[PDB]
């Protein structure tokens, strides 16, 4: 269905050190296709998934000079944020930057996003019109002001509603074969108890993708949340994902329930139940 | 594909 | 406004050249650019911040920009040849007149190198 | 690669001017005109993102990003809109400006 392309920008001061780190992540969905780290000897923009290295060295200069040209932004960022919270020259802090354009299942522009946060919290941020800004605190109105006066919003929108749409949809045709795959989730149960009176039945879902998933106990057919604990998305290393559900049942009682498994990766929904 | 050239400063 | 030092330079081939600009201040973006007679501006290097973004129109051997603080920057050529006679412009911006198209030129340096 | 035409026009006083100018990179987004005075650094005209058309005055600048063609018109000529013009064009990934090569305008008073 729908899809998404999204960079994330972290940047960190040293201060003892001769600039801050800072490191840039590209991702289709739950894909990721390039990075950047200012520390990394090759001082270039680089390829993370098989099809985009099939981009030609234009694309490649003018990918690592914009990755080089943000690196600066967000030094002389740190520097004015010191400021204006005024804060110590020695203390470490952090600014990132996240944005993106989301896409439908017809592959047409349905949002876009672009995000700012000092120290973990938000500081400024475009409105869903793409025509606005959010703004956190007064540090951040000075900015809105500041971004608003320099007209920032028109050359984002053009940007998010047109040439991210364009990429991401290139990106998708070219990587179709794993950007396009949907991998069933393989599932299995495990069994566990205390002494007596209680035990504990775990489902698994391995080897998924996409990362989207939703695992449900019911007790007699009856959609139950009640101690019941989901553990977070976790990437497996080769691209999949993991992800358990377990719930704590009365002893005796195991045959009751029943593991719910959607996944749009599978035709219909998948049911397990304890069997011994 | 990044946008840019670049961004304003804060 | 963009000052850029010297007007004019006659000089024979051989020596090093060195070519100044001083931006205005307040801005963080500096271009240097190269024109030779009867035809039009091509970029050599711009700046932001004081650090090389684009330096694709550098020639591959002899020429070499440098910008040690906000508010100066060289280029050099060593050796010069005549081929490198030209007018040299030095421009200075800030994000928002870019996004305008918006730059400011200095006054340019009419280089001769001669035989 | 950008091409212009050099070849130096010369119009009456009144008279309307046409430049224009190809390019063959299909990245290219923005697009400006500039003046140059003989002896001087280029003052820009007019700037163009998109496709579209742009009146200022005496001045029209137009792009046609499916030809690859783009113009500046300017109407009732005067003496003083004598120099080189010079079409400029970049994308998004660089602030690097690509030129072409200028045409050379007399208005005769």
């Known amino acids: 269905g729908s899809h998404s392309m999204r960079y994330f920008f972290t940047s960190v001061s040293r201060p003892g050190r001769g600039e801050p780190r800072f490191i840039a992540v590209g991702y289709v969905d739950d894909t990721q296709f390039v990075r950047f780290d200012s520390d990394a000897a090759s001082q270039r923009m680089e390829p993370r998934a098989p099809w985009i290295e099939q981009e030609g060295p234009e694309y490649w200069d003018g990918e690592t000079r914009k990755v080089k040209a943000h690196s600066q932004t967000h030094r002389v960022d740190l520097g004015t944020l010191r400021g204006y919270y005024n804060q110590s020259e020695a203390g470490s802090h952090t600014v990132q930057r996240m944005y993106g354009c989301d896409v439908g299942s017809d592959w047409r522009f349905l949002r876009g996003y672009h995000q700012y946060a000092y120290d973990g919290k938000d500081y400024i941020a475009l409105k869903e019109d793409l025509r606005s800004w959010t703004a956190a605190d007064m540090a951040a109105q000075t900015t809105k002001h500041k971004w608003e006066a320099a007209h920032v919003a028109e050359q984002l929108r053009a940007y998010l509603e047109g040439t991210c749409v364009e990429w991401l949809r290139r990106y998708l045709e070219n990587g179709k074969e794993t950007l396009q795959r949907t991998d069933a989730p393989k599932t299995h149960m495990t069994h566990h108890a205390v002494s007596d009176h209680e035990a504990t039945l775990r489902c698994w879902a391995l080897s998924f993708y996409p990362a989207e998933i939703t695992l449900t106990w019911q007790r007699d057919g009856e959609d139950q949340t009640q101690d019941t604990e989901l553990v977070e998305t976790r990437p497996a290393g080769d691209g999949t994902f993991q992800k358990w559900a377990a719930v704590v049942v009365p002893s005796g009682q195991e045959q009751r329930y029943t593991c719910h498994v959607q996944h749009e990766g599978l035709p219909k929904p998948l049911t397990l139940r304890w069997e011994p | 594909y990044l946008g840019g050239p670049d961004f304003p400063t804060i | 406004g963009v000052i850029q030092s010297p007007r004019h330079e006659v000089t024979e081939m051989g020596q090093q050249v060195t070519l100044r600009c001083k931006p205005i201040?307040?801005?963080?973006?500096l271009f240097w650019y190269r024109q030779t007679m009867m035809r039009g501006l091509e970029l050599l290097i711009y700046?932001?911040?004081?650090?090389?973004?684009?330096d694709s129109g550098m020639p591959e051997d002899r020429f070499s920009a440098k910008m040690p603080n906000a508010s100066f920057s060289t280029l050099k050529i060593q050796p010069s040849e005549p081929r490198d006679s030209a007018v040299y412009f030095c421009?200075?911006?800030?994000?928002?007149?870019?996004?305008?198209?918006?730059?400011?030129f200095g006054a340019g340096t009419r280089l001769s190198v001669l035989e | 690669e950008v091409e212009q035409d050099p070849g130096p026009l010369s119009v009456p006083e009144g008279a309307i001017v046409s430049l224009n100018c190809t390019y063959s990179?299909?990245?290219?987004?923005?697009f400006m005109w500039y003046r140059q005075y003989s002896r001087k650094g280029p003052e820009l005209l007019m700037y163009?993102?998109?496709?579209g058309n742009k009146e200022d005055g005496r001045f029209t600048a137009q792009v046609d990003k499916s030809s690859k063609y783009i113009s500046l018109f300017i109407r009732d000529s005067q003496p003083s809109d004598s120099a080189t013009y010079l079409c400029?064009?970049?994308?998004?990934?660089?602030?690097?400006?690509?030129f072409g090569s200028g045409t050379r305008l007399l208005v005769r008073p």
């Open positions: 990179n299909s990245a290219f987004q923005y």
């Open positions: 163009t993102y998109s496709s």
């Open positions: 421009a200075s911006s800030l994000w928002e007149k870019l996004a305008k198209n918006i730059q400011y």
């Open positions: 201040s307040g801005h963080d973006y």
């Open positions: 400029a064009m970049r994308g998004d990934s660089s602030y690097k400006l690509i």
């Open positions: 700046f932001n911040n004081n650090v090389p973004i684009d």
